[PDB]
């Protein structure tokens, strides 16, 4: 108790910061109840009674839907909008409505297309070529 909260202390020492909550669905569902006050009002009370202001932070929550999970969401029968709609509806079944209502925007990341993978390989190779080039190793990939 004579140590602070780790999050509260880190935010108090760096009030302009990006906060990432990573793989939120793996956490216990009730741990998010703490963020309700942070997102509505930007204030979290440390157990010492110290108010830490989040009003200048950006709070990002990533969540994973596995390959099986999003396969199971497809419609079976004869004959991106439907993917987003079903994924968001399934997200609503995992979190309280009063939590999602705080969130400024819920964004769906689409499965990478083939030419997007090609551009990703292009970018990773460009970075590698630059790092080797400053070592005077000139490199090119067909």
């Amino acid at each position: 108790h004579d140590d602070g909260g780790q999050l509260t202390e880190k935010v108090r020492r760096k009030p302009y910061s990006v906060i990432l909550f990573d793989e939120i669905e793996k956490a216990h569902p009730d741990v998010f109840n703490i963020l309700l006050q942070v997102l509505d009002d930007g204030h979290l009370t440390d157990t010492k009674g110290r108010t830490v202001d989040f009003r200048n932070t950006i709070i990002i929550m990533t969540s994973n839907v596995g390959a099986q999970e999003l396969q199971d969401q497809r419609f079976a029968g004869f004959g991106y909008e439907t993917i987003r709609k079903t994924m968001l509806k399934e997200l609503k079944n995992s979190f309280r409505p009063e939590f999602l209502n705080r969130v400024d925007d819920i964004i769906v990341f689409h499965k990478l297309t083939k030419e997007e993978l090609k551009e990703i390989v292009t970018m990773m190779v460009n970075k590698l070529t630059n790092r080797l080039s400053e070592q005077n190793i000139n490199i090119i990939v067909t």
Binding site: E25, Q68, E69, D72, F75, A76, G77, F78, G79, S94
Partner: protein, 189 residues
């Protein structure tokens, strides 16, 4: 019947394949229509109306027919609920099966390219004192009146043409069923 298991954050759902299809609002009518089957179908229709009152329901049909009363139970449930019901003949629609096939939402009645449909007058029976033979015969005739009238209202065919065509067992291809107005189109692959 194999089991499908879907794994989620909260837990594990285990579906029989028909319960997995029901998750997508598919109802399977794949046996003789009796009271047990009709009660199941009615309860599934009501549940799907509750689960979402505005999305279509798909009724897959592959039945040799069955009890007329239970088929009217299914018909009246389909007619009551707000969602449109799409009816797809998977392989056969005989007797009340073809009646329920014609009961789908207008423009949403389908057959697979070579599934067959059959129409005939209702079967029944009586064993009696002459008054009871008369009573059973009159009841069966009123039941045929009901079926012919509903078919005339949903196919657009005249009531005399149905009275004539349903006299003996009548088999129809998907194309013949379409031009007879029992279905709205054949599902091209």
């Amino acid at each position: 019947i194999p089991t499908v298991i879907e794994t989620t954050n909260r837990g594990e759902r285990a579906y029989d394949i028909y319960s997995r299809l029901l998750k997508d609002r598919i109802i399977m009518l794949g046996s003789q229509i009796d009271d047990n089957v009709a009660n199941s179908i009615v309860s599934q229709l009501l549940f799907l109306q509750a689960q979402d009152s505005e999305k279509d329901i798909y009724l897959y049909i592959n039945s040799p027919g069955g009890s007329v009363t239970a088929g009217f139970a299914i018909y009246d449930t389909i007619q009551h609920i707000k969602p449109d019901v799409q009816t797809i003949c998977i392989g056969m629609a005989a007797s009340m099966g073809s009646f329920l096939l014609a009961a789908g939402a207008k423009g949403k009645r389908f057959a697979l390219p070579n599934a067959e449909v059959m129409i005939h007058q209702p079967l029944g029976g009586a064993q009696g004192q002459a008054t009871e033979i008369e009573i059973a015969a009159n009841h069966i005739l009123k039941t045929r009146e009901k079926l012919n009238r509903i078919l005339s209202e949903r196919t657009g065919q005249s009531i005399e043409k149905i009275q004539k065509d349903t006299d003996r067992d009548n088999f129809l291809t998907a194309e013949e069923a379409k031009e007879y107005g029992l279905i709205d189109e054949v599902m091209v692959p």
